Amino acid sequence: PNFSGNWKIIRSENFEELLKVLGVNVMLRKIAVAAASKPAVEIKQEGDTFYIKTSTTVRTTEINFKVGEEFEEQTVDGRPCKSLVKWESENKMVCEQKLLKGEGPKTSWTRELTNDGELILTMTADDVVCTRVYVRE
Numbered sequence: 001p002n003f004s005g006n007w008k009i010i011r012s013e014n015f016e017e018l019l020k021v022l023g024v025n026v027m028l029r030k031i032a033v034a035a036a037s038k039p040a041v042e043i044k045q046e047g048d049t050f051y052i053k054t055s056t057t058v059r060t061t062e063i064n065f066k067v068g069e070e071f072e073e074q075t076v077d078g079r080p081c082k083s084l085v086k087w088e089s090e091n092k093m094v095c096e097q098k099l100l101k102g103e104g105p106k107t108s109w110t111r112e113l114t115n116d117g118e119l120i121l122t123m124t125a126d127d128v129v130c131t132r133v134y135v136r137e
């Protein structure tokens with residue numbers, strides 16, 4: 001797979017609901033949903049090594065990881081976690097997360113390149129799943 005690109009969002013589902021499961025209050029959800037409606041996403045992939053930068057007006061994250069090697073990031077709601085990404089399949093990576101401190105819903109994410117050339121991000125918190133779809137700019 002080649003996940004490299006500058007990716008533009010074309011669909012979001014259940015993001016507000018995901019934030020509600022994670023305990024984000026309604027005013028903060030409103031801020032977040034609006035900002036997340038127009039993100040800039042940069043991915044660079046070199047084999048199993050990845051750089052992903054996701055930028056919005058209210059939050060930007062930058063992660064560097066190798067598939068198969070633990071790394072530290074934050075959950076979508078901003079809590080430090082340890083993460084490990086695996087290939088579920090040739091074109092789909094899955095990341096399990098464990099909080100560094102405290103308790104909360106079980107969180108994960110997936111990124112997949114679909115047969116039509118798009119990118120699907122999913123983010124999960126307990127049983128609630130957020131689906132976001134992107135195409136390169």
Ligand SMILES: CC1=C(/C=C/C(C)=C/C=C/C(C)=C/C(=O)O)C(C)(C)CCC1
Binds near residue numbers: 031033035058076132
């Ligand atoms: C949740 C949350 C916030 C904003 C989070 C944002 C904006 C996340 C965007 C995610 C994207 C942009 C995902 C993607 O597309 O990969 C703010 C800072 C208001 C503080 C309250 C907790």
